Amino acid sequence: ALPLLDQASIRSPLMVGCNGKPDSTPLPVDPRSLVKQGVNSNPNAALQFNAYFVDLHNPPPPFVNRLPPRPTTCGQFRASATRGRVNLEERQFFQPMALATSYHFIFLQWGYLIRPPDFEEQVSKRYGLYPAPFRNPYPLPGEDPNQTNGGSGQLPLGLIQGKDDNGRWTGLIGASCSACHDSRLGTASEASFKWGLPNSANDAGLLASDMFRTTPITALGNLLPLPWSTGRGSSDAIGLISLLPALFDMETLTLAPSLLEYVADAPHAGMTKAPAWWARAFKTRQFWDGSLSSDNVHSEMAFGVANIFRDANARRGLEDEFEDINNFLISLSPATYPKTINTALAEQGAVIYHERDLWASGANGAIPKPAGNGSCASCHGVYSPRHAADPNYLPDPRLKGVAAVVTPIETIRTDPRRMRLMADERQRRAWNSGWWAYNNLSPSWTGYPSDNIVASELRRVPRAIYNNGGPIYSPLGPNIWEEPTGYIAPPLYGAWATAPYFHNGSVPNLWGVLKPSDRPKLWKRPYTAAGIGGKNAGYDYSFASYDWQKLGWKYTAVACNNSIFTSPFLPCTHNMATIDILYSMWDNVAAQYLNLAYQSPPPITDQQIKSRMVYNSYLYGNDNGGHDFTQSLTDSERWALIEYIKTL
Ligand code: HEC
Numbered sequence: 001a002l003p004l005l006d007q008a009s010i011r012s013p014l015m016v017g018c019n020g021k022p023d024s025t026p027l028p029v030d031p032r033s034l035v036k037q038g039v040n041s042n043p044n045a046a047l048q049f050n051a052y053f054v055d056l057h058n059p060p061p062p063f064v065n066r067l068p069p070r071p072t073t074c075g076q077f078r079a080s081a082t083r084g085r086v087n088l089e090e091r092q093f094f095q096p097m098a099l100a101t102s103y104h105f106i107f108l109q110w111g112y113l114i115r116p117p118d119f120e121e122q123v124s125k126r127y128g129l130y131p132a133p134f135r136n137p138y139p140l141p142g143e144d145p146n147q148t149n150g151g152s153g154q155l156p157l158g159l160i161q162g163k164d165d166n167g168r169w170t171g172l173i174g175a176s177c178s179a180c181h182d183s184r185l186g187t188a189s190e191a192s193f194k195w196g197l198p199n200s201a202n203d204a205g206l207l208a209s210d211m212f213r214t215t216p217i218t219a220l221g222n223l224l225p226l227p228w229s230t231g232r233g234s235s236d237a238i239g240l241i242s243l244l245p246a247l248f249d250m251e252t253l254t255l256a257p258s259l260l261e262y263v264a265d266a267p268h269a270g271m272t273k274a275p276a277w278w279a280r281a282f283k284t285r286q287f288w289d290g291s292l293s294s295d296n297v298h299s300e301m302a303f304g305v306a307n308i309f310r311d312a313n314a315r316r317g318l319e320d321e322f323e324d325i326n327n328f329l330i331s332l333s334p335a336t337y338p339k340t341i342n343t344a345l346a347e348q349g350a351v352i353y354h355e356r357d358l359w360a361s362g363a364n365g366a367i368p369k370p371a372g373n374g375s376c377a378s379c380h381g382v383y384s385p386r387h388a389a390d391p392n393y394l395p396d397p398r399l400k401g402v403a404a405v406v407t408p409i410e411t412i413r414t415d416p417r418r419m420r421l422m423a424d425e426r427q428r429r430a431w432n433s434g435w436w437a438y439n440n441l442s443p444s445w446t447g448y449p450s451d452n453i454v455a456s457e458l459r460r461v462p463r464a465i466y467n468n469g470g471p472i473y474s475p476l477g478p479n480i481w482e483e484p485t486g487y488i489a490p491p492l493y494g495a496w497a498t499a500p501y502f503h504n505g506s507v508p509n510l511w512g513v514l515k516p517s518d519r520p521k522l523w524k525r526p527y528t529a530a531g532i533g534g535k536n537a538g539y540d541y542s543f544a545s546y547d548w549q550k551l552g553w554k555y556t557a558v559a560c561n562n563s564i565f566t567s568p569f570l571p572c573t574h575n576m577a578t579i580d581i582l583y584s585m586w587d588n589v590a591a592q593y594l595n596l597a598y599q600s601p602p603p604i605t606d607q608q609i610k611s612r613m614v615y616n617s618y619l620y621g622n623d624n625g626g627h628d629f630t631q632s633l634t635d636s637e638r639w640a641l642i643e644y645i646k647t648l
């Protein structure tokens, strides 16, 4: 009789299927693509999927196929995934922030007078980044990076110089996808790097603030569209989506700002933490709200499109590179747990995971219960091969580990600010009717509208009319931003490693997810020592800072206090928020491109840095409540479930 545990180095199903197989081998089925209407052939099964995959390559009628085919063989996929990884390491997609020489001297902006000899480490510490596992070069003053293979300086993982769309080293530094999407757990002596472990430590606001005070890349230029944060390990990255229609023609990606499609009063979505790329292969949808099909890469393209230096053709023309990025992400598997596991305890956990009804014996009466068996599995997915072969649990064994449930907010009840991001029909319609929704697949679509500002102004008006309930103007595409209803229950493969948890990174360990009463409202992880100069302590990421029992960061609880003399200053209310917490780069970028009053990024002070280094659940969007149906568990059930998660 099949195993309960399923520990695997190779998790990604295409990589499982291609392992040791020649290039010409027909690619394995992507199980995410099986999650379509009809999948739930047993309506009484423990798990009922509700977030369906949408195939944009061969779209439902009346849409037409206009995308190059996805890979059809193991060799095609592997070559694509290699190109994806090279793109992540060397291509400058994300908006450049600073000249290489300004970055070389950025200790000036930290308040140092001369370069400390630990400069390269202090960069990592200050900004919550890591020593990169690849050569990540930038040119020292005087060096021409196109004669010196990028330069002899090295950047941390998370920053990039890279190569522009003409294949040349740019001489400019910005963030990379890895600033948010990647991190090290364990020093490089303790652990190899694996892609797709979301960053718990990055401070996006502090990098933006520092960079803003360097020599402008463009002398008179506008503020840059770049993300901010209230602290570390989450950011307003997703705020970009709301910003997009303010700056860019939504059909052509021409930079042509307009008032007509920007809802300037959509509520701020809060901070979100990056989901884990290394389980992309199990997720039918993108984004914390499950809003888009995982077949789509236009969402993955946002930061490359939002770069102010590209023209409409170049922005749209990033698509091939992003399909290769996407294939690298689907090729990923999570790191395997590096410590000891009690196999028998993990098997008790496996059972609890798949079978224990959290609403059993009248528990959690006040939390609406979804269709299914009330177990972890009824939302997150079925992991156990034994349960995967049982139609009381899963209708198809190929669906093992698939996360395709968006849990309604009335049940999940975690911080709701993020689920309001595209709540307004007007916003979704702007998206639905253009390039973002792949409206080139409409049967009514001819060609891209003209790439010119006058014509872009012409089209804005009937677009806004459609957005507000009027006649169709631009055709609709199949890559619809779904109306939000809740949050995706994400894959727990790899979750051992990815603390802190929930979409806002508010809960520092798995125990806390499992026991709401033990979640600290404010919590501080172990820091590194300050560097030479006495500043830039960072978050320590060595194994000693991780909690191998409760599965998460070691932390010290801290009390909120509105007294101004306290340090770190950690208010009990979002109302006492300081200027660095309230700032929105996206808001001011929009204001400035729309010829409205705008506020430039505040210089973030060292006292504010002290507060950004502690997680505060009281800030807007930062609540640590929710997923409370785990309170019905016993502590014995919780330890078993933790041991089981170690095996995922
Ligand atoms: C922080 C400033 C980020 C940078 C730079 C990039 N990404 Fe990101 N990404 C980020 C967050 C917080 C989220 C979740 C947003 C939300 O609230 O829903 C994402 C989401 C993705 C995803 C989908 C992941 C999933 O749902 O499993 C992908 C595939 C992704 N981002 C890709 C990506 C690429 C390719 C980037 C560089 C061009 C990139 N992102 C930059 C945070 C940030």
Ligand code: HEC
Pocket: 353, 358, 370, 374, 375, 376, 377, 378, 379, 380, 406, 407, 411, 412, 414, 415, 487, 488, 489, 490, 492, 495, 498, 500, 501, 502, 503, 504, 510, 513, 627, 629, 630, 641
């Ligand atoms: C549906 C009703 C669910 C049940 C039952 C369980 N989980 Fe859950 N989980 C769910 C959602 C929708 C989310 C995302 C919440 C958010 O806003 O972020 C979660 C989150 C977790 C997490 C954190 C995952 C991450 O941060 O990437 C863990 C570790 C987790 N869930 C584990 C878990 C276990 C062990 C359960 C059975 C006891 C369990 N969950 C039940 C949806 C639901």
